Amino acid sequence: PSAGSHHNDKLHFKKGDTVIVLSGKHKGQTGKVLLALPRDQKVVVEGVNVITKNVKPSMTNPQGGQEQRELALHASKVALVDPETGKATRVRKQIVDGKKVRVAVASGKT
Amino acid sequence: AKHPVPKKKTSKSKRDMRRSHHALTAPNLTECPQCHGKKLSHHICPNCGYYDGRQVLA
Amino acid sequence: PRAKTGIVRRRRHKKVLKRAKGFWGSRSKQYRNAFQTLLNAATYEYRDRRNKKRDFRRLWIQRINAGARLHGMNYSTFINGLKRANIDLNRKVLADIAAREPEAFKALVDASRNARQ
RNA sequence: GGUCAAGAUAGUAAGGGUCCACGGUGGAUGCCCUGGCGCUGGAGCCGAUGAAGGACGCGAUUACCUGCGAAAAGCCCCGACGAGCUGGAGAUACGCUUUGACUCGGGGAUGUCCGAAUGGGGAAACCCACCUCGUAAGAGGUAUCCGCAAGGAUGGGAACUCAGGGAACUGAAACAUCUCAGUACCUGAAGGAGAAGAAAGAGAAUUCGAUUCCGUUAGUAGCGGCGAGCGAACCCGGAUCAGCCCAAUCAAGCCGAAGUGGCUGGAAAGCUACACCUCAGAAGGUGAGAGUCCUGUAGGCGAACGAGAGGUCGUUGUUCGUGAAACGAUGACUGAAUCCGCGCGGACCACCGCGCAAGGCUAAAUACUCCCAGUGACCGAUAGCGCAUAGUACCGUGAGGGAAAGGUGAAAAGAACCCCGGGAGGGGAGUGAAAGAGAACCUGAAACCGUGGACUUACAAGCAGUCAUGGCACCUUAUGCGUGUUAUGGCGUGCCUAUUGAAGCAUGAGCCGGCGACUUAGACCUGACGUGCGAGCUUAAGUUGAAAAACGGAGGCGGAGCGAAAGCGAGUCCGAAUAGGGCGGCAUUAGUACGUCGGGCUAGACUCGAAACCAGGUGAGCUAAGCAUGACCAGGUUGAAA
RNA sequence: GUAGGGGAGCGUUCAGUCCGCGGAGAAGCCAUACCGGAAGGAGUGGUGGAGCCGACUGAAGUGCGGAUGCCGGCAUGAGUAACGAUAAAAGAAGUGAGAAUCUUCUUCGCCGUAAGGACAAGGGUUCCUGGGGAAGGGUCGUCCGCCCAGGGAAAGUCGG
C-alpha cells in the first residue's frame, strides 16, 4: 500500500519547534509542534482544529457530545520560522555543544 | 432425463398476462362500534376484545 | 502491447440497438436479435423503394378508370384517346385532376372521346 | 325539443405493447496502484558447531501474520543516526528515551522438540534408557561409513553440468529397418559452474600446435527401406588464452544551489507579474500540474573495522543404417614389440608424411537463474504469476488438483444529538469542495426486475418487420422539419452452418457483458513494391564507445558454361567429324544489401476436440483373495454310529 | 455474385514527434432529429471527478453472433414440484417486539431384543452455565448440535 516513505521517514521539525503552515486553509498560521510522526508524515501543531464526535455508550457516561481537538497534517507546513516567514536550512557547526548541528538560512537563528 | 420440458422461454408479456389474476383483494374493514379501531366483519374487535359485550381480555 | 476490445464493441452495439425503435420484445432490447431483425429489414427497405413506385401507379390508375367510368368510359379507352390526341401527354398528374377538378377531368374525357371515335 | 324505428360511431383495460422519466440489480468501461512478467547486469551453494523445511511456544490483552526461541516481538558489544519509540494493527492500559532509545550496518551470546537425525524405539514433532560431572535443578556423551589421529562423509538445492539406465505417441500419409531421440523420464555424483584439456591429434601446406565457446565453411562432403529424412569436419575470422607434474571499489550514512506577490479555486504546484539556481530540469511526494516547499538529484565526504596395444566373436560412437568400413570403444576368449622400436593416415600393400597410448592434476572464455538491482512501442484486476497474495479456502484415501476476491476522503474530520423500528434499514442535523464521497464507500454499461407518464390494445391468424396513408402527442443538431406513438392497407419463409437443394419438422444457440482463432522464428527459399550503392553489392561473430553509433571483409551473392566424371572452355557433351542436346552471341537490357508485403518450407504453425500409446509414481481405509489373532449363531424339530 | 484473387480506406491499444485542452470540469458512461459513399465522425446537454483529444510516422495480444465455446451476472419453467417415512396430537399456563413451532403443567399416541442402556471405532469441545438471534435449521423461532464468552475433563490398582 506504501505510506510516507516518499520522503525518508525523515522530517524537518521536532516535537517543540514553532512552524508556519504553508499551503491549503490555515495558510501562514503558526504554532508549536506537539506531535511528530515521521513514518506516517504527521504534524500535530496548534493549527488545524477539528470538532470530533464521541461514540461513547458504556465508555465513561453516555454523555459523549462534541470535542474540541486539533487534526494532524504533512509537509503542508514549512518548518522553522524567524524572518516572519517559511524558509529552508543551510549553516551547521556547533553551539557550546559540539556533537549538535544547528540549522539556519539567509539569516542564522532557529 | 426430466421428461416434459418447456420448449421456449415464456416472454415478459406472456408471463405477465398469466399474473393478471394474482392481485390480493383488500379486506373489507369495518370500524368497531366501541374502541374505534378497525375490525373484520364477524370477528371480535382486536383492540377492545368486544363483540356486543367484551369477550377477549384487552 | 495488448489491445482489448474496451468501448469499441459497446459503441458498435448501441448503434444497432438504437435503429431498433418500436421493435417488439427482444428485437429492441437484445443485440443479436435486434441486429438479426435489421438484416431482414434491409431486404424490405431496398425492395420497398422500388415497390412504392408500382404501388402508387396502381392507385393512380384506379382513380383514373373510376372517373373515366363516371363519364361512360374506362382507363384502357380514355388513355388511348389522350394518346391518340398526341397533344395530350399528362400521364403524371392525371389522377389528381379526376379526384379534385371534375370540371377539368370532363374536358379531357370529351377530348379523349374525339381522338378515338 | 319527446316517443318509436333505421343506421353509424365513441368511450371501458383485467391485463398487455412501444416510447419517455425516474429508480433497483449487476460489475462492463475509464482512471488509478499497493501486484506481476520479460530482458540486461550482478551475485551464486547450505549442513553433525546440526541444515532445507517444520511442530509447540514466547505478548498485560493474541485467534492470523511477523520476529524470536524458555535469556523467547527479544539479551550483550561495536559503529551510524539524532527524537522519538512501544511489529503488521487500523487497539486502549503500562511505560521507554539526549547517562542517547527507535531504526539501520557489523559482530557475539541464547537457540525447546522434530527433521541427514545420529542413544534405543517410533504411526515426524513423541515414548523409553544407560554412562560421566553435579547441591538438586541442570550440563556433556552414547549412529554408521573412512582412516593412527587431526580431520572428512551422510542430508538439502529452481535451473544449469557430467555419468549409469533409457520410452512411446509421432514422421515415414499403412508398417517392421529408419524417424521422433539418446528427447522425455528415472537414478548417481558435484559445483558455483561444470565438462573437456596439454596430440600415439587434426590433417595434405613436409602447414597446424591443449580444451571449451561464437561466427563461418554448409545443408557442402557424406549417411539413407539412397525413402521419410538425417548431417559433419579442416581452412579462415573471433572470445579467452597457462601449461604443469609423476612412473623406471561495494553496502550503514552525512553534506548538498536557488521564489515571492496578486489572481481562480475547497485546496495551487496551475494562471499572471517581476525574480533567482543550474557540475543539480532524474525521480517520487505535498488538498491540481512541483527546477527554486519536502525527500532528493549533480557534485563531494564517509565508518570502528566488514566482504571482494593388436586379434577373432558380439556391438556401438561421429555424416558411420554391414557397406569396400578404416579408427575409437569393450562383454567373451586370446595376446606383441621396446627406438636399424610402436601407432596413425577411411579395406589392403609399398613409399612418403604426422605423432610417442597403456599415470594424475590444471584457471579463463561457456551454461543456468532460487535470489538482488536497473530498465521496457510488457500487463493494469476475466490482464499480469495460481495468488494486488494462497498454494490458502475448497476437492481427493493418496499421488495430486486448486479458486475468486482491488478503490470513502485531500485529511477520519468515520456522522455527538434527534425521529420510525426489537433490529436491520432509513430520514434529519453536523463534518466535507462534494455525503450527487457514509463505511455493501471511485466510475457504475448491458442483460434482468420495477414505479410513474404519453400514445394505445378485449372479431384476432401472427419471422413480428418494411413501405404508404390517416389519427393523437411533442418541439434543446427540432416547426415543415420532423420526433415519439398508433390504426388500416400492400408486401414479406429468423440467423448461421452445411449443402444439388434450408423458414425448414437438418446443426448450433436462454439473454447480456467481458475473454476468445492465420501468428512468430530463421545470416532459410522464391516473387511484388520500395530505397542505397551499382559491374559490382554486402557484412557475421566480435571490438570500442553507448542520453549514439562507429569499427570489424572471415564469409555470402553477381561475375561461364557443358559433362556421369576426368576435364575442357564461349565453348562443351554423345560419336570414329558433322545429326543433335544443352550454352554463348543473342537484336539484346544488371546486380546486390536492407525494408514492407505475397507465397513456400521447418517448429504446436488458424483456434478448439479424441479413442489411444509411453514414462515415473499414488492406491487392497472400497472391492477380490491370503495369513495371524479374537468375536458370533434365540428357540424348536429329526433321532445316525456306537 | 459464392469460393477465390486484386484495390482504397475506417477503428482500437502502445510508441516517437508536433499542436494543444483540462478541477470555470479530463477519460468513461447516458440522450440526440447533425455530418461523411461505408467502416465511422462531430456539435449540444446530462453524469463523472483527474486526466486527455487532434495530425504525421512506427509497432501490434488490433475489430466477434455463432465454436453443445470460457468466466460472470441475470432471466424462463413459476409463486410451480417439493419441505425427506402415515408414530398422532390436544388444551391450559408462561415468556417475548413478535409464538402452531421456546418453557412448564395435564392428557393423548409410537418404540420397548428398542426407537432403552454401556462400550469400541471415528469425530473434536459438539458437554455444562450465561448470553445472542445475521447466516446454518427445508416453515417459524424468543430455541438449537448454530454464534460469542467463561467453565468442565482428576487414577499405584480401569485401557495402553
Added chain:
RNA sequence: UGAAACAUGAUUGCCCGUACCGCAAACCGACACAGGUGUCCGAGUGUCAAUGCACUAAGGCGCGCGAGAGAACCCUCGUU
C-alpha cells in the same frame, strides 16, 4: 561376623487415555440424508419354547412446515 523368608511401622506411587456423541441430527454417506457401522446389557404378561408375535415397565420419542377440503387421477390398504 550383617543370608533368604516372615511380621509390623514409615516412605513411595512416572507417562498417555478419561468431557460429549457413538445403530446416530455429533461416525462413513456433499445433506439435521428411510442406507451403512464391531461388541455387551436388553425387564413383565400371555403364548410348547424363544432374543418369535401382541401389549406394556424403566427409559426414550411424536420423525423441524402448518391448516382446510373431501374432485379426476396416482400410491398403500378393507369388503364385495
Added chain:
RNA sequence: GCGACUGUUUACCAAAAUCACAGCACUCUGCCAACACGAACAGUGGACGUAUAGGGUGUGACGCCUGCCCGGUGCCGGAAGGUCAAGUGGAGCGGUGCAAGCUGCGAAAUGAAGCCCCGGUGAACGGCUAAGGUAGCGAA
C-alpha cells in the same frame, strides 16, 4: 427337461441349465522334484511335504457302460541314411612391394540339437480321403 446333492456367481438389468463339488481318468514329477514368483549361481512357494506325494488337463454323485479310424497335427520311442550352425580344416584364386614378407576372399572333409523318414499313441487335438456309428438315445 436340465443339473446328482449343500454350496458359488455377473457391487449397480442375467442366481441359472454358469462355475465349484465328492468321485473317475490321462499325464508329468525321484527331490537343489516337476512347476511357479524373481534384477538374481539371491531368496521363496511347492514343502519343514517325498510317488498311498505334489503339478497340470479333462469329465463331474451313483448305476450299467464308453465302440470304430493312428492318414494330417501333437507327444513318446528308434535310427540304415538324407538335410543342417559356429568352429576345426585350409586345397586354390587375387592385391602390393625389387624382395622376404604383409594381406583380401575362399572350397572338400569333418561338426550338435532340430526337420524330412519309420513304429507307436484317442478319458491326445480331431474324424465318422485313415475309417465311415458298437450299445443307447432320437421331430430332442
Added chain:
RNA sequence: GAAUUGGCUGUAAAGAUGCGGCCUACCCGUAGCAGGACGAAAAGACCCCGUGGAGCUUUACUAUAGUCUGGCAUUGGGAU
C-alpha cells in the same frame, strides 16, 4: 433462436402454427388429458466410412522371455 405459437387442403428438401388458398376464432386464467411441437435427454450403441484405436485368436509377418544344443572360459591329475 426469438414468438403477436389455430383447422382443412395444397405446395415446398419429399410429414407446414410461420408459404398459397379456403375455413374457424373476443381478451386472460385454473384443474386436467397426452395427438403434435419430426416434444426433452445422451455429438446413434445399429449401419457404412477413417490407410482411427484397443481386447482376443491363429499353422498371418517380424522379434522376443523362456528353454533345448555345438564350441570357448571357470576347469584340474591318472589310466585306454
